[PDB]
Design an enzyme around this catalytic site. Structure first.
Site, PDB file in Angstrom:
ATOM      1  N   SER A   1       4.534   2.258   8.761  1.00 33.52           N
ATOM      2  CA  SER A   1       4.289   1.115   7.883  1.00 33.52           C
ATOM      3  C   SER A   1       5.611   0.591   7.331  1.00 33.52           C
ATOM      4  CB  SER A   1       3.419   1.549   6.711  1.00 33.52           C
ATOM      5  OG  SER A   1       2.116   1.019   6.838  1.00 33.52           O
TER       6      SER A   1
ATOM      7  N   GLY B   1       3.360   6.803   8.742  1.00 31.28           N
ATOM      8  CA  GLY B   1       4.708   6.737   8.181  1.00 31.28           C
ATOM      9  C   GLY B   1       5.563   5.633   8.765  1.00 31.28           C
TER      10      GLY B   1
ATOM     11  N   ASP C   1      -0.158  -7.769   1.562  1.00 34.29           N
ATOM     12  CA  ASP C   1       0.283  -6.366   1.605  1.00 34.29           C
ATOM     13  C   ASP C   1       1.816  -6.308   1.817  1.00 34.29           C
ATOM     14  OD1 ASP C   1       0.055  -3.497   1.689  1.00 34.29           O
ATOM     15  OD2 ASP C   1      -0.715  -3.469   3.728  1.00 34.29           O
TER      16      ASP C   1
ATOM     17  N   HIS D   1       0.803  -1.228   0.000  1.00 34.38           N
ATOM     18  CA  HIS D   1       0.000   0.000   0.000  1.00 34.38           C
ATOM     19  C   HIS D   1       0.853   1.304   0.000  1.00 34.38           C
ATOM     20  CE1 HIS D   1       0.061  -0.227   4.546  1.00 34.38           C
ATOM     21  NE2 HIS D   1       0.238   1.084   4.396  1.00 34.38           N
TER      22      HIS D   1
END
Ligand SMILES: Cn1c(C(=O)O)cc2cc(Br)ccc21
Ligand SMILES: Cn1c(C(=O)O)cc2cc(Br)ccc21
Lengths: 642, 645
Positions: A150, A148, A92, A68
């Site tokens: 992730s 931020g 993901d 993502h």
């Protein structure tokens, strides 16, 4: 654009600190060249696109981050862009062979329940392990803090990798838990074959199966392959999002393969008795899904499509096919999730410049490029389509606008034309064009859980994704040489859709298909639990809960919002019902609240506001039981990407 | 970096007013031109689409000057052919800046006729009708979400013949819906163009015959707070000297007796002296605690550090501006080294050195070399208490005498003799007067912002922002005073100076209520004076809104209020008022953060959803919106709120 290392989190009792290595100029040059001579140090990278900053974690000699964030992008590296070694949209997860210098975290084995999340600020957050992919924040923190972060690691006390952070689990804007990709999912991905050939159709298995068919448009996906299956004695159903394409498969099969198929659209049905049926997802959902025994094979064509009818239609296939006696579901697409737009042998690609007579999205179109021949111009809005077609008409060019609401008879089938169209053209009209000029932007809907009082559906202009780019360009170069002109060179990652699409499925279930919200969940769960399809945040429980409360709609308002054709007819009519019954005015007098005009002189006082579907001009009351109910629904755990 | 032309809005030449965009630069192109200040591309069109590294907005050439908003462009240069173009006009009060355009640039010309049918040209090249309803106001014919108008500041309002009426600067909002537009009229422009480019203000004013407000922009150390009252007193005038800090107040007072031969009056909370001298040093706090201006006592009021946008300084100055003429003063001096629109230029005593990644001490993404802080007395600016404590603990390990200073510490924790490294927040500059061999700057700080979030009401958000020009100068200024110094920084550059947020207006009404016994109406008068006086830091006028909010917050618990006051944290009135509503409903606070510690005692007895009035941080507990005070504040959100674009 490449992903760029812009800094690093150095790890050690687990303590951390950050070192920035790149400013703005450098980041943007490095993204463009893909060449990064900067030395890679440590196990945690601070990474950046032009749009977004996040983290990347090295485990087992692979640099991992979130799909993502990174999409299918290259990593800028020493001897140039590094293409991704691993791409798992279902998990993901992406990965690049870890650049020289980078250390790896060793996987955690000795199953610890005390976890530590490393953030982009170099904070080390206690996290108690719960499920396989879940951990609870020991001190709940506002979601914005985790943004931020992730792709950052979750560590056991020894400082070994449990997995990488991908999403925050929210209660009314406060993160109580974290969702992570586990180290075991990375291992599985490291063991899976890099390129898998899905170009050929499967042979019909003895026990039920879901197969994937990755082959171009007009390679036979929907003509040759149903014909060949029927030749083996099978009954085939082919589902397509487009009325025009379904109707057009009917004459193509009678000519090319000697089958007069059954055709099933809202506007036109033909029952011939043939072993091949073409239907749209909508007409299939209208007919009540899978007919017990009718089909051996279901081919869900254009399964990259993320309109609500398609997702609900496919999820109905996946939940009903095996019980209905099917042996094979083929999910078929040319643009699977993770796909990127690549050169096409028939299509010459040319960037628009600032030189030309016709202003277009800050760039210019020369009169010579579109004077003569048949050309398609994609615009983002119907207003842009009318303005551009009116300019071209004055300029003496034969020009025509097509968007939702217009009949396709506006398009001439032969002779010179410039068609100025929105993406509605994809489902109304089947033909191809000498050139396609693309604005490279589209109108999208997003949900915001704004708590003002409940949620908001927002309408934004966003850059196109890889699916949009390829489907737009694919209107040229179809057995002919074609030209493709573009405003912008880039594309967003493909195979992701917004939670407002889930809401749209529930809405359409309730408005068109006489589906309970519970029944809608079953169908959508089937879709979500099937890998290789587009991905969404799992908000099925929340969306089910709000539609469950929407009891006793006014059938005349619902009919009216249905007839008018606009989005969220159930939500719109349910707001209007609450207003009419509360003897109260609508949020505003936009064309949305049309159904309330006959009650305009009797409706006074504050709006019993349920949710925001546009601008709210009137004073609002939060006192309505339905409002109180949707406000209680906001306490649901909502997974949101960070 | 510079402001860069990245495109243009082309207006129709004939018939109905229509418009299209031309994009001339990409992102990479923008950022190279921003750094070099060199733009060799030709200037076509009246309306430019300009960009900084962070925002993007519009600029309109009217009469050879490229005009735009101060809140977008700050005091930044414009990229031009032979390098960066310095601003010819900077007006923070009008929110209007101007560069001399290139020879051959096309300018709009004023509206000669003076028509009431107006047209806003937006950055998407949409031409939208406005009905003129004032010199600087217009009603949107169709009201629109605010979001649509964002990025269109600096755009023109055009009369039906394509002539400039003004430049767009703000939307007038009812609950997220722009209903009206604010602009800088073309009249304000042409005034400016006829006027002096250069204004003095470097020298203390002569005492006028009748009441006047003057500005004194002089370096910190030109004796603006010592030499200039002493020279005024030597002339026979009675003078009051107002300062944000008690350490500077006592410090100046002690200096006067030592040097300039006057034992002055001192007025602070900790120390008050009455000598009967013609000079009085006071804090804005003690001035406001004394109930403002005493009739006939002072001929001259020096408002020192008048760049400070703390609530007590603003309330203090606003009071002086409202009371000084009636109290028989002749002169108000607004004194600062860093006025609105000022910019950090080089100092001769201070060597400025960018931090690298090489160094033993990690600091905000870069590193401090251990050897740089081994040699003497050094000051390290950090944005938070946490960062200070964590850094002073690391330097403590590395064999360096590091001490932490923040709000709530005694200044005696920091020594005078040497060797030292003080790791401080901005609380240093109000708590401590000493200079240093070197300053290390994180170049960020913590600020508060209001968000009109309608969930149910407003949010005060705490956020870390890049520092502004004022912050840089004041922090740098703690080195190189009379002798050589060293300034080390993480980031070069600064946000524009002399703007503050609506939440500071909230804080003034809060402080009025909590500390100074001012009704919201009384606070409004004081702040109105402040906002109407030009040359002072600027803010969106949300006075009517904030007065309405605090007007309804009646019968606060005296005990909780005294506790939030003593604890020293922000919004002591709002914190204590929310707690009052909780306690009396037997409800828990929005969370068990340190903000809500006056309720800890009551935690066993507190149950159910919190009756939420507004958001001052995270909210963890379930909420109810049925409280009469929630309803009252929701009703206040209907106010016309002016928001920038
Ligand atoms: C108003 N509008 C238009 C248009 O034609 O302007 C396209 C479109 C698509 C979605 Br999804 C939502 C709203 C939209
Ligand atoms: C919690 N905190 C700190 C800190 O030391 O962390 C600095 C600061 C400044 C403002 Br304005 C508001 C809250 C603040």
């Amino acid at each position: 654009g490449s992903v760029v290392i812009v800094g690093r989190i150095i790890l050690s009792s687990i303590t951390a600190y950050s070192q920035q290595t790149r400013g703005l100029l450098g980041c943007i040059i490095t993204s463009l060249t893909g060449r990064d001579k900067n030395q890679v140090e440590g196990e945690v990278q601070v990474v950046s696109t032009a749009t977004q900053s996040f983290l990347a974690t090295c485990v087992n000699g692979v640099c991992w981050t979130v799909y993502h964030g990174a999409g299918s992008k290259t990593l800028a590296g020493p001897k140039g862009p590094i293409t991704q070694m691993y791409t798992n949209v279902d998990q993901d997860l992406v990965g690049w062979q870890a650049p020289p210098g980078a250390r790896s975290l060793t996987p955690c084995t000795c199953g610890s329940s005390d976890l530590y999340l490393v953030t982009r600020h170099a904070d080390v957050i206690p996290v108690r392990r719960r499920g396989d992919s879940r951990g609870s924040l020991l001190s709940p923190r506002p979601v914005s803090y985790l943004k931020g972060s992730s792709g950052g690691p979750l560590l056991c006390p020894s400082g070994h990798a449990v997995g990488i952070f991908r999403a925050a689990v929210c209660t009314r804007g406060v993160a109580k838990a974290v969702d992570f990709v586990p180290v075991e999912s990375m291992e599985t991905t490291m063991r899976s074959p890099v390129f898998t050939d899905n170009s050929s159709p499967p042979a019909v298995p003895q026990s039920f199966q879901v197969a994937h068919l990755h082959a171009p448009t007009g390679s036979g996906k929907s003509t040759k392959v149903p014909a060949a299956y029927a030749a083996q004695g099978y009954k085939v159903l082919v589902l397509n999002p487009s009325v025009a394409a379904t109707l057009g498969f009917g004459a193509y099969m009678s000519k090319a393969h000697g089958i007069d198929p059954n055709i099933r659209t809202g506007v036109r049905t033909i029952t011939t008795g043939a072993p091949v049926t073409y239907s749209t997802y909508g007409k299939f959902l209208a007919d009540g899904g899978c007919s017990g025994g009718a089909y051996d094979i279901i081919i869900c064509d254009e399964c990259h499509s993320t309109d609500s009818t398609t997702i609900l239609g496919i999820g109905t296939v996946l939940d009903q096919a095996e019980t209905a006696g099917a042996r094979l579901v083929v999910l078929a697409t040319a643009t699977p999730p993770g796909s990127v737009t690549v050169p096409h042998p028939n299509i010459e690609e040319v960037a628009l410049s600032n030189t030309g007579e016709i202003p277009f999205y800050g760039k210019a179109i020369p009169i010579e490029a579109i004077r003569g021949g048949r050309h398609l111009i994609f615009c983002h809005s119907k207003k842009k389509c009318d303005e551009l077609a009116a300019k071209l008409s004055g300029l003496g060019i034969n020009a025509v606008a097509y968007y939702r609401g217009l009949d396709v008879s506006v398009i001439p089938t032969i002779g010179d034309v410039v068609v100025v169209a929105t993406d509605a053209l994809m489902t109304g009209y089947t033909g191809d064009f000498d050139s396609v000029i693309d604005c490279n932007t589209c109108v999208t809907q997003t949900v915001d859980f704004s708590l003002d009082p409940t949620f908001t559906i927002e309408t934004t202009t966003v850059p196109q994704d890889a699916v949009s780019r390829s489907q737009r360009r694919g209107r040229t170069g179809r057995g002919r040489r074609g030209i493709y002109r573009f405003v912008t060179p880039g594309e967003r990652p493909s195979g992701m859709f917004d939670s407002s699409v889930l809401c749209e499925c529930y809405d359409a279930g309730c408005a068109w298909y006489e589906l309970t919200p519970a029944e809608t969940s079953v169908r959508l769960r089937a879709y979500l639990n099937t890998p290789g399809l587009p991905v969404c945040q799992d908000h099925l429980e929340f969306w089910e809960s709000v539609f469950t409360g929407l009891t006793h709609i006014d059938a005349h308002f619902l009919s009216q919002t249905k007839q008018a054709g606009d989005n969220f007819p159930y939500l719109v009519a349910y707001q209007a019902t609450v207003c009419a019954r509360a003897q109260a005015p609508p949020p505003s007098w936009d064309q949305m609240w049309k159904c309330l005009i006959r009650l305009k002189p009797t409706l006074h006082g504050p709006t019993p506001l349920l949710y925001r579907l546009g601008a709210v001009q009137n004073e609002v009351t939060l006192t309505h039981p339905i409002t109180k109910y949707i406000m209680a629904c906001m306490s649901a755990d909502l997974e949101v990407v960070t």
